[PDB]
Design an enzyme around this catalytic site. Structure first.
Site, PDB file in Angstrom:
ATOM      1  N   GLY A  84       0.815  -1.202   0.000  1.00  0.00           N
ATOM      2  CA  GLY A  84       0.000   0.000   0.000  1.00  0.00           C
ATOM      3  C   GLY A  84       0.858   1.265   0.000  1.00  0.00           C
ATOM      4  O   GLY A  84       2.047   1.240  -0.359  1.00  0.00           O
ATOM      5  N   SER A  85       0.256   2.347   0.480  1.00  0.00           N
ATOM      6  CA  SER A  85       0.806   3.704   0.362  1.00  0.00           C
ATOM      7  C   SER A  85       2.162   4.094   0.941  1.00  0.00           C
ATOM      8  O   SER A  85       2.636   5.178   0.626  1.00  0.00           O
ATOM      9  CB  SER A  85      -0.267   4.730   0.741  1.00  0.00           C
ATOM     10  OG  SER A  85      -1.179   4.780  -0.308  1.00  0.00           O
TER      11      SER A  85
END
Ligand SMILES: [Cl-]
Length: 684
Positions: free
Chosen positions: A271-272
């Site tokens: 993810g981010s």
């Protein structure tokens, strides 16, 4: 006929000598009652019936064994040697010595003691999955027992921890069965080496407590947290949930317990937090204008896939115009995807290669996963926000070190020192430089943009609007942070799960921001209850504790071992072996190998089979499939020369011979077949 005598297994320590795992010897008492157990002159060496009652008096007073039980056992029909049940086992050394003195003073012969070794983990629930377990295993050939590492570090460093076995002649009955406690050692065992890990017991203890609170708040199915020295790559604390007590195993049989090691086995879409790498690449590529704006209102389309921001997918806003710096603070997938498209797929994919995604760290543990990197155009775009790409926690840590250490990537380390206490020699670790994905300036700017993730009251995903301050705070320091959410794949449908909070949530933090000392990475999968504020429960106090320690975390047995003779090490014959496992073995022995290429066989090595390799010495392992120029940052001149000779490349040097590579005139990844000359800059 001989019987193996297991050597004492090495002790596992924290960085300052606090015991994490050590051998513990207890004893089992036996009584030989056979009237056949006599010397060649018929001296009775067995316990005689005239003495049975005195033995019972002794066993009652010393072990709390009822006289009638001792007497019963001693009178067993057809028995050669008898035991005395649970009270007759697990006897400490002090009590055994007392018992022996008592039989000797009472003139009673025939009583004996057999040593049984168990592994003790004094800290209980403490880096349990990291440490692993060593268990007693029966050798089916002679009935001997020895401790063998089954999981984690115990299994990974089993060769070092395990000493050289001894040998003894046990007496046997006429049936060939071994009589216990009668041994005559013929070959002394040689103790295993001790391993000082990089862990800080005080910090680790503190992390365990805060992680328990974090799990109570989130009720996630799993979680992990690791603290790393930003300048050295040393792992100072590491834990995962759910966990177990290492000494008692309590928790392993609990519902929901997960046996997968979250530091190096588990593969996941990060993810981010991957936007940290993305942003650094954009800055390094020269394709980042912080002030340029864009709109996330319509998302962005790549191939046949639609990409949108979190607030759009949750109906928080109809869309908005933002600066790229703001979109980074806001964790805008659209803004990051735009940055990826501006540098292009080829460039971004090469940055992921420079960051070494898809390649295991080979940092010393066995069973490490490699992650999965796709070359599909859609996945390459998605990877800009950490989807469509699989990593291990340790791959993320490795990548984060380049951000925290002026663009210079370091190998994560968990071994501080390997000590041979018999010989009084040691091998002590130093940092291992393994590449340079981005410039010092790009790393520094990335860290500064990451402050806003925490401080921007309008856009920062890690700003606490309810308190008017950043979620993550460490004293009065500026803190470099990036949060992440990641979609999780479903096994049934294959595609991502859609439930509320059915995500992988994470954060990376570096403090102080401008000149980092520590990196912390935390993850929690599928929290029942979630709020970014929960990260404060684990990150804030742990990083504050780390900062408050000072010279306790910098120092280790290294400071006091500089005048200690160094243990010799040689590779032995490794041509034809598998590069991966060999590199892993070399790091366990504190060598810093560089694997050249992608082949599954070792073709050449820069040092010979019987050549001594000093602690931290850098060596080259050329595999059988090597066609692209490596990132040579940090290579010694000797290694540049060896490489050049192997591949017939003409090198021009700038700088003193004592240095290591700081610049190369031909970029990493160029075909070796067309590379004839390179200008290498050395920095001592
Ligand atoms: Cl490697």
């Amino acid at each position: 006929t001989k019987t193996i005598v297991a050597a004492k297994r090495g002790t596992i320590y924290d960085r300052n000598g606090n015991v994490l795992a050590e051998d513990s010897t207890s004893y089992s008492i036996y009584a030989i009652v056979s009237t056949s157990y006599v010397s060649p002159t018929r001296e009775k060496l067995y316990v005689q019936e005239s003495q049975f009652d005195k033995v019972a008096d002794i066993l009652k007073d010393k072990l709390g064994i009822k006289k009638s039980y001792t007497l019963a056992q001693l009178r067993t029909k057809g028995a050669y040697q008898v035991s005395f049940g649970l009270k007759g086992k697990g006897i400490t050394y002090s009590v055994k010595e007392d018992l022996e003195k008592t039989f000797k003073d009472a003139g009673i012969k025939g009583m004996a003691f057999e040593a049984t070794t168990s592994r003790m983990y004094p800290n209980g629930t403490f880096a349990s999955e990291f440490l692993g377990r060593a268990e007693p295993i029966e050798n089916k050939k002679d009935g001997s027992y020895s401790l063998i590492g089954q999981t984690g570090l115990e299994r990974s460093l089993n060769s070092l921890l395990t000493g050289t076995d001894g040998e003894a002649i046990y007496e046997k009955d006429k049936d060939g069965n071994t009589l216990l406690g009668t041994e005559t050692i013929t070959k002394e065992a040689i103790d295993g080496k001790n391993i000082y890990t990089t862990l800080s017991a005080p910090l680790q203890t503190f992390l365990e407590t805060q992680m328990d609170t974090f799990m109570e708040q989130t009720k996630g199915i799993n979680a992990s947290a690791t603290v790393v020295n930003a300048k050295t790559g040393e792992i100072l604390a590491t834990t995962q949930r759910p966990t177990y007590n290492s000494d008692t195993l309590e928790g392993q049989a609990k519902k929901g317990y997960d046996w997968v090691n979250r530091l190096y086995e588990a593969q996941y879409e990060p993810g981010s937090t991957m936007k940290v790498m993305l942003l650094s690449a954009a800055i390094n590529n020269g394709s980042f204008n912080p002030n340029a704006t864009y709109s996330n209102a319509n998302g962005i389309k790549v191939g046949d896939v639609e990409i949108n921001d979190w607030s759009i997918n949750e109906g928080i806003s109809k869309g908005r115009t933002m600066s790229f710096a703001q979109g980074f603070s806001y964790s805008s997938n659209v803004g990051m995807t735009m940055l990826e498209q501006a540098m292009g797929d080829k460039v971004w994919s090469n940055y992921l290669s420079l960051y070494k995604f898809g390649i295991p760290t080979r940092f010393g543990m066995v069973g490490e996963s490699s992650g999965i990197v796709s070359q599909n155009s859609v996945n390459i775009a998605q990877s800009s926000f950490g989807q469509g790409i699989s990593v291990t926690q340790v791959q993320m840590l490795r990548a984060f070190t380049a951000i925290s250490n002026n663009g210079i990537m370091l190998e994560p380390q968990f071994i501080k020192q390997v000590a041979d206490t018999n010989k009084g020699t040691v091998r002590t670790a130093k940092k291992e430089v393994i590449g340079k994905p981005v410039s010092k300036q790009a790393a520094s700017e990335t860290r500064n943009y990451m402050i806003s993730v925490g401080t921007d009251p309008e856009f920062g995903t890690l700003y606490n609007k309810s308190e008017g301050s950043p979620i993550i705070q460490v004293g009065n320091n500026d803190v470099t942070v990036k949060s992440g959410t990641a979609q999780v794949p479903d096994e049934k449908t294959g595609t991502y799960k859609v439930g509320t909070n059915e995500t992988l949530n994470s954060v990376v933090a570096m403090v102080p921001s401008e000149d980092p000392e520590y990196i912390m990475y935390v993850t929690v999968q599928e929290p029942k209850t979630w709020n970014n504020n929960f990260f404060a429960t684990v990150v804030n106090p742990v990083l504050e504790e780390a900062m408050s320690m000072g010279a306790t975390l910098d120092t280790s047995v290294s400071e006091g071992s500089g005048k200690t003779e160094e243990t010799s090490y040689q590779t032995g014959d490794i041509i034809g072996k598998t590069p991966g496992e060999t590199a892993n073995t070399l790091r366990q022995n504190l060598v810093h190998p560089i694997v050249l290429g992608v082949g599954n066989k070792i073709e050449k090595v820069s040092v010979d089979a019987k050549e001594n390799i000093k602690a931290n010495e850098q060596i080259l392992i050329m595999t059988n499939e090597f066609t692209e120029l490596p990132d040579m940052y940090g290579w010694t001149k000797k290694n540049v020369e060896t490489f050049a000779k192997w591949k017939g490349i003409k090198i021009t040097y700038k700088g003193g011979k004592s240095g290591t590579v700081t610049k190369q005139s031909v970029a990493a990844g160029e075909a070796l077949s067309k590379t004839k000359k390179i200008t290498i800059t050395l920095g001592d």
